[PDB]
């Protein structure tokens, strides 16, 4: 008869119960305790300036209308019943398009205690906005936020709090990181207030701090450009009479630099300013351009002033590697230490 | 106190008819609109549309929802929206739109004692606007959003902007990676269809494209290849293989640039400014290789005339290329 007793209590709780009214309406502010478990910090898209995250969202509040007495002290509830009671209308301020999973059934859970406390958990995938400053690309670091609050209830009606200390209220799984190109350093948890045309609302915020991995750009951009510059300065050691050899050499290292520069921009988003890679490529391009101008000068002065042409080639064999090594030292000390 | 509210609300919704507009059969119901733009992104030239996220609020008075005895504004659960009458507002140029539904449907209903209803929604919409790209990338665009009632006419419903020019907020905080919003405008008018008149509100933005990306990614490589094609003039004319290889490989590089631009840019079958610049550079390197064709053809019988042609080409080509740049930039900036 335990099942019939429980059924009676279930069929008695919701008698005279209106789910269109929050608990304590007109009497007190509804206090909501929230915590987040991150199961996977998904891919980050630099093109769209957005990121994906999979979370368990846990909310807890008190509803005196749902007190009961029975053999048990905790009740686990089917998701059909969790839609009969009032729940907070929490939404993510910076969300773009989120998915609530219901395979094979809705991934929601609602537990009721005897004193009237309700625990409401759900599984969500959130695609959020992470605006980025790419002036230091690909040696940049970003703070991707996640903000949430009540869509309809002002802070005079509903307020949010973290279940524990804010540091310990957002927990990330050990295998959570699903980042091919970023390194998740940590997160900071805060809470503020926003004002809209409809009122003032409480906002709960979390910031995830990311630092970009640079090895891909090293193997895709920096190494081919360095090899092309070294080849163009290798051109200085061929004899002057080999005119077609040095002309093909210079013009093909210039076309290779042009191809690399055009190739690099595809990864980059369409930004107005110039990244650190734009400057590195522009300097390598200017180096191979000056090496071909140098050969044009040597060929112009050959057969009339061979002494001057030899002096120019001898000084270029020293000046170009020195200036390029100094530029690399400055470049990789200005940006790697930020 | 909560039981009295439950009684009053159930009293109001008892006998309420959703199929009838407020003041049905009498004076038209006036609806005020507010838009709070949250973000604008993905302005697509290929798809010829843009994506907009906003908070859309509607205010109207319904005498059937007036209550007394409670000195409060009642914000109700958004599922009560299915039990009330709401305007049949729609966007005429919307290709795809949806209401956010995490963790619940992003909808709001608020009631006031005099019977005024506030109805809010959080909407992401993709709106189509035609782009005239004859001056691309030095072009300005004007993209709009049209708000209209699907079924009612001006004898039933009326639209106005709530707050005048302050009805739309959040434009000043928008940052676009490629564009910059110059101005926004609000227009109210009626549209005379075959079924009668229809109230309409319009919100338009004017966009001015940024140039730094095209300067550092498109025009500079073509300029540098054009300047490098002039290196041939300082090489001796008997180096036939070097000058031929330089001319035709610079032609091939310019062709590769144009082809890949054709692969990435939107298929817009008319002449733009970028096509004029790329074609002008291609003409300059084509004529530089035809000049070496002439020099190679005459450097044996008349080596002095071929040397004088190369020397004069060292002056004529940079001067005519700077004159071309001056004319191009004056006509487009």
């Amino acid at each position: 008869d335990n099942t019939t007793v429980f059924t009676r209590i279930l069929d008695r709780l919701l008698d005279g119960y209106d789910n269109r009214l929050r608990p304590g309406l007109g009497e007190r502010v509804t206090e909501v305790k929230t915590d987040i478990f991150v199961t996977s910090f998904g891919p980050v898209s630099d093109h769209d300036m957005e990121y994906t995250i999979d979370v368990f969202f846990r909310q807890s509040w008190k509803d005196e209308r749902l007190k009961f007495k029975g053999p048990m002290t905790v009740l686990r509830l089917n998701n059909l019943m969790a839609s009969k009671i009032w729940t907070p209308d929490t939404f993510f301020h910076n969300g773009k398009k989120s998915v609530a999973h219901n395979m094979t059934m809705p991934n929601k859970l609602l537990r009721i205690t005897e004193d009237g406390t309700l625990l409401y958990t759900m599984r969500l995938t959130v695609r959020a906005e992470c605006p980025m400053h790419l002036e230091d690309f690909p040696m940049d670091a970003h703070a991707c936020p996640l903000k949430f609050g009540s869509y309809a209830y002002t802070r005079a009606e509903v307020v949010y709090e973290w279940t524990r200390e804010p540091a310990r209220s957002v927990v990330v799984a050990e295998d959570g990181s699903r980042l091919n190109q970023y390194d998740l350093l940590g997160q900071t948890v805060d809470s503020g207030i926003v004002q809209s045309s409809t009122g003032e609302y409480v906002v709960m915020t979390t910031h995830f701090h990311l630092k970009r991995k640079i090895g891909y750009f090293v193997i895709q951009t920096y190494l081919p450009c360095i090899m092309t510059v070294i080849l163009s300065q290798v051109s200085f050691w061929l004899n002057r009479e080999s005119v077609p050899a040095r002309t093909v050499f210079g013009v093909t290292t210039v076309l290779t630099m042009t191809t690399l520069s055009i190739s690099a921009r595809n990864s980059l988003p369409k930004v107005a300013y110039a990244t650190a890679m734009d400057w590195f490529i522009a300097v390598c391009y200017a180096f191979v351009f000056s090496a071909l101008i140098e050969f044009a000068t040597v060929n112009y002065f050959t057969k009339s002033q061979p002494a001057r042409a030899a002096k120019i080639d001898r000084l270029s064999r020293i000046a170009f590697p020195l200036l390029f090594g100094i530029f690399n030292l400055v470049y990789w000390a200005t940006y790697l230490n930020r | 106190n909560m039981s009295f509210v439950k009684e009053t609300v159930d009293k109001l919704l008892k006998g309420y008819d959703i199929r009838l507009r407020p003041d049905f059969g009498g004076p038209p119901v006036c609806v005020g609109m507010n838009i709070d733009i949250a973000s604008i992104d993905m302005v697509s030239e290929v798809n010829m549309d843009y994506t907009l996220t906003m908070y859309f609020q509607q205010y109207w008075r319904d005498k059937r929802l007036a209550y007394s005895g409670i000195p409060l504004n009642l914000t109700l659960d958004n599922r009560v929206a299915d039990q009330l009458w709401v305007p049949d507002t729609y966007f005429l140029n919307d290709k795809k739109s949806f209401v956010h539904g995490v963790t619940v449907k992003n909808r709001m209903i608020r009631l006031h004692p005099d019977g005024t209803v506030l109805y809010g929604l959080r909407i992401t919409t993709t709106a189509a606007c035609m782009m005239d790209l004859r001056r691309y990338p030095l072009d300005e665009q004007n993209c709009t959003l049209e708000i209209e009632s699907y079924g009612y006419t001006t004898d039933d419903i009326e639209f106005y902007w709530r707050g005048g020019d302050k009805a739309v907020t959040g434009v000043e905080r928008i940052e676009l990676p490629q564009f910059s919003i110059v101005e926004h405008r609000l227009v109210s008018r009626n549209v005379v269809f075959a079924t009668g008149a229809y109230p309409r509100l319009s919100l338009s933005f004017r966009l001015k494209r940024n140039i730094g990306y095209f300067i550092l990614q498109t025009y500079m490589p073509s300029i540098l290849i054009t300047i490098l094609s002039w290196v041939s003039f300082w090489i001796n004319y008997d180096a036939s293989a070097a000058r031929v290889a330089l001319g035709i490989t610079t032609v091939l590089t310019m062709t590769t640039i144009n082809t890949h631009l054709r692969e990435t840019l939107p298929k817009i079958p008319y002449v733009k400014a970028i096509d004029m610049y790329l074609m002008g550079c291609f003409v300059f390197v084509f004529l530089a290789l035809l000049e070496y064709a002439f020099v190679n053809y005459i450097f044996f019988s008349q080596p002095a005339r071929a040397a004088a042609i190369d020397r004069w080409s060292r002056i004529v080509f940079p001067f005519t290329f700077s004159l071309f740049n001056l004319v191009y930039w004056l006509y487009y900036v």
Partner: nanobody
Amino acid sequence: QVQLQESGGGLVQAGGSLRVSCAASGRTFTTYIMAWFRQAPGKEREFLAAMDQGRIQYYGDSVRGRFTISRDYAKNSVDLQLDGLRPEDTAVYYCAAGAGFWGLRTASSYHYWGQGTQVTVSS
């Protein structure tokens, strides 16, 4: 160059309103977090308030309910309304802008800083 120029400040008689402003130049900070800090004489630099791109307002646990922050995004500026001032509020108020990496409440995460503005409270 980029400069954060600050105005306002001065002295007040243990109360009244005091709106300290901050105007930016040389760079648009629409996508940045603009904040206010406070440095009492010789003690330490203290976080006061901050506002991000989404108009979310953050406040220190000592000035909540007394100081109000705001931003004029069109003019690229930020203001701080000081109300119910106390003698303990006599310090040098700073204006900062940053991306909030590793924390928006820490002073070591802001790229640009103002020249300061003395606020004196007399009782």
